[PDB]
Amino acid sequence: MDMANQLLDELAHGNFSHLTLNLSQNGREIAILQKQLTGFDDKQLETFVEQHPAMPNDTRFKIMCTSFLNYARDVDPWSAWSSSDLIFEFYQCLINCLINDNAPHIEMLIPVATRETEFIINLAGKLDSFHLQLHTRSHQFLSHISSILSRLFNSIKPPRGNASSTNIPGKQRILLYLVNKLNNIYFRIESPQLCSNIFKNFQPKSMLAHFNEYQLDQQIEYRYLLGRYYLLNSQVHNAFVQFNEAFQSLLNLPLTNQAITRNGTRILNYMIPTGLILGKMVKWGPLRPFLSQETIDNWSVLYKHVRYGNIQGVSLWLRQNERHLCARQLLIVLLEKLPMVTYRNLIKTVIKSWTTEWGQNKLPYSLIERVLQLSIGPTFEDPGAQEITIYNGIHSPKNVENVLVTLINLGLLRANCFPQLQLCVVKKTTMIQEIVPPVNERITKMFPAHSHVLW
């Protein structure tokens, strides 16, 4: 039997059972096809498609069918590189068949395209790892895929304001799927800022009235990537609400698979430090299934240092954790934004025993310098610290006023300061929260985040 003629019959009628680049699914059929297609030249393969009786009269669809015959004829299963031109050519031809919303068989093709997208992404990473041997630039393959998926994303149009039916076309059903695949790629090629256009144009293209109408797994991953994108731009609160909702939604998933535990862990790796910057600390109970005891112990040490105002302990903790923190883009933001929460707690204790207990309204700078001496410890100027570091070069006990000024400007300390009297005055009261309000409320009121529920 002429299996090429059989294949084209299937493709012409939207039966794509065998239209796949995955030989672990397609192998025996492709092998038979390769044997039978051997001997026919490119123009002959093209003609087989052009003249096939039921073939949709669509240029891009025939290009795609022909591209697959070429692939089947010339594929070398022993060499992923040698076969790659056929594989990536066909994939591009396949996605091109989705650009027109009224393309032939587009609805049957949507599942094919997602299936093949997962295949080609994996193959692209494989080949990109050999870029030096292949004389290609870093991420050239996977970046080519991002461009293809980007053109597809741009072709998805929003619903007509007065649509005649509720039908969710395939391109809309995979809108968030595509957003996440594309943004994941941009993160993997180490260009996360390319997510900007994707994030910006996601909601305008969506036909669904509520973000919660998408699959919950796609929601969670979206919030995960959006939270990371925010955190890359140091927008801590904007990131927090996404990580926090991402974990909440995940807790609402049945833990059918281990990958869900590990995905929850991925969220917590960012939700914990993000919340800490905002003055929030987790209850480990609901987190036990997703974190090892050691990771809990580790974040609990940092919790202790921040909670009680030990700047030196925070810096030591960041120093010890530097490598993996850099890998998750967490070191700088924590280095920068943990201090003032730690300072707040430092002077919180000071004001508690000094004002609330001992009834002293005035804070002499000399006192706070002594407190900072204990909290900061060593500095770039001090002996034994010949070389400047991000851990000894930022915080100094000498800059009492500066610390207090920023605490007051962030709204974490309600106080007046007298530079020529070298003291700051708090309100004479027994209620500590009147002088040092709850951190999270203050920060979140100064930096209101966008609606945690996107829409």
Partner: protein
């Protein structure tokens, strides 16, 4: 190994209060805090 340590979510076949209400009220005597209170005592005693 790479799929389990990478920050990218893993694929899986598709089918509550987690935050301390407040940590300013829940006060636990800490080592660093003990030395801080001691420094407040020493400062209070050395200064009128």
């Amino acid at each position: 190994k790479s799929l389990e340590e990478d920050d990218e979510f893993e694929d899986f076949p598709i089918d509550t209060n987690i935050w301390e209400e407040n940590w300013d009220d829940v006060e636990v005597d800490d080592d660093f805090t003990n030395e801080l209170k001691a420094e407040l005592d020493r400062y209070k005693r050395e200064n009128q």
